[PDB]
Amino acid sequence: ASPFRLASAGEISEVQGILRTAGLLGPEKRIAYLGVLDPARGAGSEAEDRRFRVFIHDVSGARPQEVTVSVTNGTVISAVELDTAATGELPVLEEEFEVVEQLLATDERWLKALAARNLDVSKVRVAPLSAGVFEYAEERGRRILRGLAFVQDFPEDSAWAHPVDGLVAYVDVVSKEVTRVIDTGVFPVPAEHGNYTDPELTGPLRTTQKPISITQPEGPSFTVTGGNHIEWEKWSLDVGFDVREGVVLHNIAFRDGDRLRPIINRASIAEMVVPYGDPSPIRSWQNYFDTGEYLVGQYANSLELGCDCLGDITYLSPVISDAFGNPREIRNGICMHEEDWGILAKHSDLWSGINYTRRNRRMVISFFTTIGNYDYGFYWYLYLDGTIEFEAKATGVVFTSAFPEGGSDNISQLAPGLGAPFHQHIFSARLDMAIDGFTNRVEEEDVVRQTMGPGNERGNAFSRKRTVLTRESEAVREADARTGRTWIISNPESKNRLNEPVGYKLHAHNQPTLLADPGSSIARRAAFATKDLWVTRYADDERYPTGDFVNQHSGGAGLPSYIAQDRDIDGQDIVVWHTFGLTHFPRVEDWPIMPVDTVGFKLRPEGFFDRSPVLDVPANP
Amino acid sequence: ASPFRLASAGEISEVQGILRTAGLLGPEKRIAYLGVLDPARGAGSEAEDRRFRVFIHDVSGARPQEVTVSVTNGTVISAVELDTAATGELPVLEEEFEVVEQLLATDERWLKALAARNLDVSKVRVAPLSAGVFEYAEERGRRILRGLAFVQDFPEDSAWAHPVDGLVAYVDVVSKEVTRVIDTGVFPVPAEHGNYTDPELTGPLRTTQKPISITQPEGPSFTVTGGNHIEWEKWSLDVGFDVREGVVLHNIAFRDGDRLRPIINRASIAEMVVPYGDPSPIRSWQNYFDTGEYLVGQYANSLELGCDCLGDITYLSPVISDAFGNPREIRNGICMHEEDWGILAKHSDLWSGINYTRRNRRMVISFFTTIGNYDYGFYWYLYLDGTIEFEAKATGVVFTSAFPEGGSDNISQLAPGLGAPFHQHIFSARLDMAIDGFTNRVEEEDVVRQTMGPGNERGNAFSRKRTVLTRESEAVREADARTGRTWIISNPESKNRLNEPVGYKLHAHNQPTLLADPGSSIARRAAFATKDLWVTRYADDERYPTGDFVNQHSGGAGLPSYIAQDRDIDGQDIVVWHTFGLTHFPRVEDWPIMPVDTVGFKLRPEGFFDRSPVLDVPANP
Ligand SMILES: [Cu+2]
Ligand SMILES: [Cu+2]
Ligand code: NA
Ligand code: NA
C-alpha cells in the first residue's frame, strides 16, 4: 500500500512498544510530538520504510530526546539528547496547561492580588500562554508558561467577558513553581456578560431561515482508495495529517490526457504566529506560534454533519499519539466534499449562433482547530480549471483586556470597560514545488508602465517583466500590489506546445506582513513573517520556517539560516514559503463571538496546459 | 405602489405615445437610451411622478435631443437639442453595428485588401467597435465606428480564431460612408480553429461528474413584494434595472431590532472601460466603455435554469425600450437566490463546556451581459453579518490578433500564429452612501508602525490612524496595500452605544488602476480609472464618472469636473466612486474560451451595530 498512507492505531502502538522495549519510554517520559516521516527523495522503488519522529519529554527534569524509529524493522534508528537552552524547548504539553491555574491558586502573591480586587479564587480561570524569550535570564533552559486571569461568574459563563487586567504571572511547569507575580494596579473587571447562548442577549431566535438542502443523489464524484488517496475530476493527491501541521497535501498531480503531471510535492501550513500590539507590560510579551508551540493538529475538532460540513461529506478520522504513546482517534477530524462554484465559462456568439455555458466545481478538504479563545478553519480548494486555493477562516472569541478610561491607541473598546488589543494572525505556507517534475525556478513578474513616445505614440502600451531568482540570497521577496506583482513557478526543461516553459502563478492577497519593530524579540523569532515570499533549495531537515523547536527559542532559527547557504535555485528542487495574514483591529461586531474573517492565496496555471483543460466538461444535466 | 418599481411595458408604451403626440418620435427618429429617473431628494411624501429620460437619435443627420417626460401627467417636461461635437455622441445603436460589415463589403479599398490576402469577402466578419477620439479631425461631430476583420470558415465557425491583422477601417454610420481603410501589411491568418463544441477539440466528454442537487423544500427565505422589493434575513432593498447601468440596488437597509436603518441609497456599476495595450496602429485606438457607449443592460442574457443559475431561483424580467419605443422584455434577465456560505461563527470553549457553531448564508442578485467576444457577470451579495460584496466575473473569448514572428512585448501567443493583446477590464462602482441617514463622511484608515522605545520598550506596538476627507479637492485617493489602507464611511451624528460614530468599512482588492500614459487620450476620457477612490457631494445630474455622453467625447467630463467644485463633504450627502479592475495578460489556458476570472470589493460594518447582529441565528435544522 501507499507510503503516504495515514498512520494507523497499530503503528502508534508499535512505536510505543519499540520505545518501551528500548528503555526510552518509562513512567517519567512523555511524548510531546509524534509523526510519520515523509519518504526520502527518490527511494519509493521499493521497500516500505515507515519511520516516525518522536520528541520525548522528561517530567523529572532530565534532558529531552529526539528519536526516530522504524516501524517496519521495529528498531530505534537514532536518539539525540537535546540541549533545550540552545536549540529551544519541546512543544507545550496538554497536561501542562492545567497546571498553571492550580499552582497559582495556592500562591500567596496571587491570592493577595485577587483579594485586593475582591475576587473569589474559585471563580478565576487562568489562560496558560506560551512564554517567548525576553529579558528574564532565569527562564533560559526552563519550561515556562505565563498566565492571564479571567473571571467566570458561574461554570457556564464566558470568562473572556471578564478580564482581570493589571495582573500576570509566570510559572515553571516542571519544578511546579510560580517564578513571578506582577501586579501593576487594579482595573475594574468588566461586568457585562458575553454569553451568546443566553436568550437574554440573543433575543428570540429568527424563524425566517428556510432550509437549504444540498445532496448528491448518485454520491460524490471523487473516490477514496487506500484510506487517503483522492481522485477527483483529473486531480490526484494524498491527504496526510500531522499533529503539528494539521492537514498536509501530498503528490498533487493532474491527469493531462494520459500523463500524470505533478504540480506540488507537499503542501502545508508550516507555521503561524499571532503577535499582539498592546505595549502594556501585562501583555507586551504575548505571541503564540500555534503550529510550532501548541501543535494545531492536536486540537482539531470533530466536525458535525449539517453544522460544520454541509452536503454529501466524506470524513477522515486521523490517529495521533497521546502523551504516553497510546493511539487517539480524532473522529471526523477532516471533511471532504465537492461544492458548486457558479459559472466556469460562458459565451453567446452572434456570428456562429452558438450559446455555451459550463459550471464550475471545487473540491474542499478542511479541518477546524481550537486553541483557547481562538478557532481556526483551514480550507484547501481544488478547481476544475487547475486552480489551487488555500483559505484560513478565523473566528472564536476575541482576547480581551480592560479598556482604559483615557482611551488607547492599541486596544479597541467592545463593551463598557471591555477592550480587545490589536493583533495579527499570520500564516506560512510551505509549498514543496514540483511543476512537471523537480527542476523548477521562480520568476517575479511585475507590470511595466510605458511612456508616450516613439513606438507608443498614443500612450496606450503596457507590458510585463519577469526576473528569475537564481540564488537563495536573491529569493527573499516583498509584495507590490501597485505593480501587480506575482510569482511564477516554472519548469525550464518542460515546454508546452508553444515552446514556452510550463508554469503556475501564485496570486497573493497583499495584506500587511509583521508589523512589530524589526529589532523586537518577535521579529527575530518570526523572521519568516517579515517578508511575503521566500524560496529555498529543498533539504530533508528544513521543514519549518521557525526551526524544529520554537517554544522559548531565541532569534533566528529556520528561514534566515536556511537562505544563508545561498544555494542555487535556478532549475532545481525548490520550496516556496509564502507569508500571509490578517491584521485584526477588533470591532464591536466581533463581540461576543466573532463572525468569520478570511485570508489566503491561490495558484493558477500559466502556460501549464496546451489549451483550456476544461473543454471536456459536459453541459449541466 | 413603490416609486422604485420597475418600468412596465405600459409605461414604455405611454412614453412612446407621449413622444409621438408631441412631434418628437417620427419615422426618422430612434431612441438611443430610455430610463426611469430616480425620485428627487426628499419628495416621496407624496404624489407619484414617474419620469423618464430619453436620448433621441435622428437618422437623417439632424441634431439629437435629450427629453424627459412625465408618464404620470402625460407631458413632455423638457427637450434640449444636443451639440454632439461639444458634449459627445449618443450611445451606439444596435442597428448601427450591422451596418459596418455591409458597407465595407462593397468598398473597393476593403475588397482590394481582402483580395491580396486571398480572402472571400462573404467569409469575413467585421467587429464593429467604438471609435474614441484621436487625431482624425474629420470625425468631430460625426458618428463613427471602427471595424476589425475576422474570417469564418463556415457559419458556425468561431471567427475569433482567424484575426485578419494589418487591416482596419473607419465608417460613418449616419451618412453610410467608409472614411478610411488602413492596410499596414499582410499577416498570415491563423488557421487552427477555436471551436469549443467540436468533439475533435474537446475529446470525449467527462463521464465522472455526478450531480449536485440544491433545493429549498420549503421555498426561499426571501420574499418579493411589489414586483421588485426584497426582504431577506433583516435586509430590505429594491432591485432596479437600467438599460445603461444594468442592475441597480436602491434603499439597501437593515432591520436592527425595530428600526429600519439605511446603509446605501443607490448602488450601481456606473461605468466600465476596457483599454488595450498593443501599440500597433491597427489596435492602439481600441478602448470601449461598455456601460457608457454600448449600454450593458441592453445586452443582458436570458439566464437558463440549472445552467446559469442553480438552486431555487427567483427571476425578474426587466422591460426596456427598443429603438422605436416599443417595450421589449428581457426574459429571466436577473437571477436571485440564497446560497450556503460555510461557517458563520464557531467556538468550542473549554472553561464553559459550550460548543457553538452557526452557518452563513448570502443572497445573490446577478445578471450576465454579452458584448461581442466578451461576457461579463455582475454579482451582488448580501451576507447575514451585514457584509455587502460586489463581484465581476469576466469570461467569453479573448480578443485576438496575429502573433508576430519576432515576438511581442504587448501580446501573448495562444496558438500557432495567434496572439491576444494585453488589456484591462476596469469598473467604477457608484455608491450613494446613506449610513444611518444622509449626513456621512469618509475617513482614510492606515496602519501605523511604531518604533522600539519609551512606552514601547519591547517593540511590539502598532496602531492605526484615520484622516477625514473634508472637501472634494482632498477626496481623490490611492490604494496602499502595504499599510492596509481602507476607507470608512461613517455618520458623525449617529452613535453606537459606546458613543462612537456608526460606520462601514470598504475593503478594496488593491489591483492596478489604469496603466496608460497620463497624457493619452484614454487617460483623459477615463480619468476616473486613474485613482482608486473618489468622493463627491451628491448632485442630481452627476450620475456617471465619465459624463452622460461618453461616445466620442474628448477628455475630462464627469469626475474631474465634479470635484473641481470643491464642495464640503464632511457630514453631508456624499457619493463614493470606487475604481477596481483586472489586468489581463492572456494565457494559453484562456483559449479557445476562457475560464472565469473575478474582481470586486466589499463593505463590512465597523461599529454600525451595538454587538454582533447574528446572535439570533438558530442552529442548523
Ligand atoms: Cu483576531
Ligand atoms: Cu480580458
Ligand atoms: Na521541490
Ligand atoms: Na449620499
Swiss-Prot record, chains A, B:
PTM field: Topaquinone (TPQ) is generated by copper-dependent autoxidation of a specific tyrosyl residue.
Organism: Arthrobacter globiformis
The EC number(s) this enzyme carries: 1.4.3.21
Descriptive protein name: Phenylethylamine oxidase
Sequence positions bearing 2',4',5'-topaquinone: 374
Cofactor section: Cu cation; L-topaquinone
Amino acids binding Cu cation: 423, 425, 584
Keyword list, A-Z: Copper, Disulfide bond, Metal-binding, Oxidoreductase, TPQ
Disulfide bond recorded as keyword: yes
Positions that bind substrate: 288-299, 371-376
Catalysed reaction, written as an equation: a primary methyl amine + O2 + H2O = an aldehyde + H2O2 + NH4(+); 2-phenylethylamine + O2 + H2O = 2-phenylacetaldehyde + H2O2 + NH4(+)
Gene Ontology biological-process entries: amine metabolic process
Subunit structure: Homodimer.
Gene Ontology molecular function terms on file: copper ion binding; primary methylamine oxidase activity; quinone binding
